[PDB]
Symmetry: C4
Subunit: 325 residues, 4 copies
């Protein structure tokens, strides 16, 4: 607590930086698969756009040597640079530094070898920012929990869908441009339009045609106007739909598990059903029918605070409600 | 209270009008996407229908200024007729007033501008009166609290495919009639029948083809004889099936939460399942291997009568059954 | 009772009759859509089969004034041959009586009017037997409940898509043979085999093609080799893929609800693994660990057999339990 | 005890053997449908592989007479090697010895009789070792037994589609090679590769094509470039997707119960959501929220998982903890 070259992690200049690299760790998570797939090296008018975005991430390298890490079991904020600067190199230092090398200038420098461009798939470790942003959005008791817990599983299931549409076009560009009729896009004809010589089509027609055959597959609709033709594309859509089957079952299971043990206000309307169904099975004279649901509304609005709340309560809370009521 | 200018909210001469406005709001929210998508301005018939579809809502928009409101906080009836007109002008006035302007004559008497027809979507706020019909049916006690959340959810799921079937046809008409072979309907050939010059086919063939696509996409069957061809129909199908993927898991999540607290055909087969871990684990007489299982057949729906709901609730009903026997 | 002109409801020679018309109730409710759709009047080789099948449902309509029942109030046997004839004649008499008429040649001996062959669709009220067989099986503890709850929903779901496969070919026979190219089967070509002049095709090829369509629609696969061509087949599959969309979300719901309320072994696994979960946060003794997991290895069965059903055993039944123990 | 012949069942040299035939019970389970579907007798290259794979199961069938079994009602490890003759010959002996003969050599030199090769399916009883591997992984308390039924039901859901992928190719070869255009592969054309004369394509192209069909059917995607054309392939696809529907519902039903049974951050929001409902009715201090919500992690798992899991435990460890303090 006596260092002062140390930011404790709720500053109004650090919370306004932590959300500044979340519109870069979203952009560099989306531009990275369609930088790998749709471009064999970036064009020259993106030279200014790709040198930034990596210039705002090595600012983040030096700036996380100075933030106060709150420990797990110690439950106190640690303030010494010796204790944060070693957990940084232990946990996340290679992930965020080897991705900050310019891999578009290296690829054009090395005689255009193809395998050096696979070292920009390590920029997909910047999805940590978005999943952490969704992670302490569950720990915010203001927003509907069923709204956020399904937005985390609808960020993942569409980001994986976006990535397995750039890989699916990359597997079409790996064949030469004379075995071009033996691929999923070079043999495509939609309406009165033919996708011949698909390296010259506009980027967004190629990207939309690729993403349509990942969202139609992800939703398990599968029209079959676009389908796999090669053998590597068959293997890729075997790997993809097998993982997407589990990813889709772990959304029904994640919605059901929040509806089943859902709102107790729905359970009150549920638990008056058997009351009415046994007062009206063997008919009782119509006397209390509204006063009972009013009294049980006032009861179950206080039944959780009758016994159930205050076995877990600490001292110096309940006496206030006890004196005020 | 001391007012005469207002109407009691449980009048059976007012709730015989809320059923009339219900079957007007059901009609003019199904026809409204059919007026948007399938017509560029209504024909010379359906004009008197277009004006009597709105002078049935003008009567309701002048009637709700004189209805009694039950307060949200104090749970009291608010009779005085300026705390309701201040309330009605704030919550529902301007999306119900601008849905009663004649947006077909305003379109045709303005030089036929296309963008003024997009104000025909504010008439889709009249599904308020259909979704509240399902909300005051849940708070009914006569039928299930969740079956009116299954018949409600199947209304919402099917209504969004009637709307998507009209937007999907509308996107085919935004292309010029000479480039019709690059659409989903202009390049269609189902059987020996070619769907060319598709603005001169009968209206019901066009609507049935579009609804056939939207419904076999909603159920995620997706045969593929009708698919997206443009880059705008690709984007629309990509938007639609993602929202449909979340709307189709909510149905399953509600049906599970209905079933998990059902009847004794799944509880009794846990009761005798736990009995047979004492009635067959510790060996028991075959004479008594009929007696208690016949008894636990005889208690549920007859002698059980949900005893805890007559245990925790006070004993005026017990005084009534003391008067019984 | 002193009547003796009534068969008792439980019997040796009567329960071997109800599982003899149970074979005729799974025959004559599976041959009935195949006789409506694929035939227009049975041929002469199938004459004696449609006569002997309807007299077995005629010696059974007279064998219901000779049987007792169990009313839900007295819950005893009600031997009186005039009470039963005013309950049988109310509920099950018309639907069980006019389905025994010889509808095959009543069609043939009335000038072959097609609308009189729609009155053999009420021979599908014979599936009362095949559903009371499955709702009798669920009150039987010889077999597990997870097998007789997912097979009642696999009888229903396969039977409805057997019916929707004969209706789907019937809608192709309602066009003339000069417009057979505008149907789903006359405009079919699977491989190098073309289904031209489909009335002159062997019955089982037509039935297998139609049922293969309806089964790959039921599972929501939907290949698209067989699709709806007309405007009346689109309407049928629009009804059908939206009915079985709820019928197949009701099956997932049952399989889920019969898993989340697991047996004793599942709760045993759960509570012992969450017992060992908090063990290695303190890391106590090794023989202590094994000894207390032995304590809760024998503290699952008789400890939680005993405490559960002692909440409900009636009087004079616990007494000989305590006497034997 | 006195017997020195037999292996003690928790040997260290019998846990490097049952993990040695678990890659021969995965090899001989994946290769046997590929030996049955894709060949007519093995080539003379693949000879010593078959012989080694069969001899390292003979060496196991004479090694399980030499072992003791844990009793399940007496719970003693039975060392007596005269009752190991029993519990093996009314157990897996004939389905370890009949499926151990050289069934390719019997087929190749007896006359090329096709029905002899159907006895290779006895070798699919060696999946019992792989399914008993997971059933010995359920009992490991150091891993969640609900996330050992998500890969157990995913091996089952992907082994049954590797097998179906070979039966689907086998039904294409039961037709003569001149009537190959009436198959699913002899009438296939993908891009510009016509799959004609399909017995001379190399093995991995045929296997990748058949597994591609079976896996996009298993996920219920179903593009429809590869569909059934025959009547045998139609009946097989009908049988396969009906099993697959129940298995896919069973996967969701098993995933759901994993999420319903507790989640700690979700349980923090299972309590905070109703705790604030009381607080906005009986309005406490707005500056007392920090006192309330801070202790909903302070005694979660520091008093919730500690003593509430311990009221079924004696205080012999509580004395150790109290002297620890
Ligand atoms: K499909
Ligand atoms: K398809
Ligand atoms: K599907
Ligand atoms: K599908």
């Amino acid at each position: 607590n006596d260092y002062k070259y140390i930011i404790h992690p709720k500053n109004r200049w650090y919370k306004a930086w932590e959300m500044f690299i979340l519109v870069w760790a979203i952009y560099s998570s989306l531009f990275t698969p369609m930088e790998f797939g749709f471009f064999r090296g970036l064009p020259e008018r993106l030279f200014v756009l790709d040198i930034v975005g990596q210039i705002a991430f090595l600012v983040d390298i030096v700036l996380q040597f100075f933030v106060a890490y709150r420990d797990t079991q110690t439950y106190r904020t640690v303030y010494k640079p010796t204790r944060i600067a070693f957990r940084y190199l232990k946990s996340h230092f290679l992930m965020d530094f080897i991705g900050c090398f310019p891999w578009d200038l290296i690829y054009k420098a090395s005689g255009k070898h193809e395998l050096v461009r696979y070292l920009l798939w390590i920029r997909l470790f910047r999805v940590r920012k978005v999943v952490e942003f969704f992670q302490r959005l569950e720990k915010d008791t203001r927003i509907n929990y069923l709204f956020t817990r399904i937005l985390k599983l609808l960020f993942v299931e569409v980001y994986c869908t976006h990535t397995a549409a750039c890989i699916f076009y990359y597997l079409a560009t790996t064949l030469p441009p004379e075995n071009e009729g033996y691929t999923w896009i070079g043999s495509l004809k939609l309406g009165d339009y033919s996708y011949e010589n698909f390296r010259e089509i506009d980027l967004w027609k190629r990207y939309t045609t690729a993403l349509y055959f990942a969202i139609v597959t992800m939703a398990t609709v599968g029209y079959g106007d676009i389908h796999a033709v090669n053998l590597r594309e068959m293997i890729f859509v075997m790997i993809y739909v097998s993982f997407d089957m589990v990813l889709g079952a772990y959304l029904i299971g994640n919605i059901t598990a929040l509806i089943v043990k859902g709102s107790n206000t729905a359970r009150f309307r549920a638990k008056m059903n058997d009351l009415i169904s046994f007062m009206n099975r063997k008919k009782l004279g119509r006397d209390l029918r509204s006063q009972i649901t009013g009294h049980v509304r006032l009861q179950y609005d206080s039944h959780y605070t009758d016994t159930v709340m205050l076995q877990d309560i600490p001292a110096s809370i309940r006496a206030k409600i006890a004196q005020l009521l």
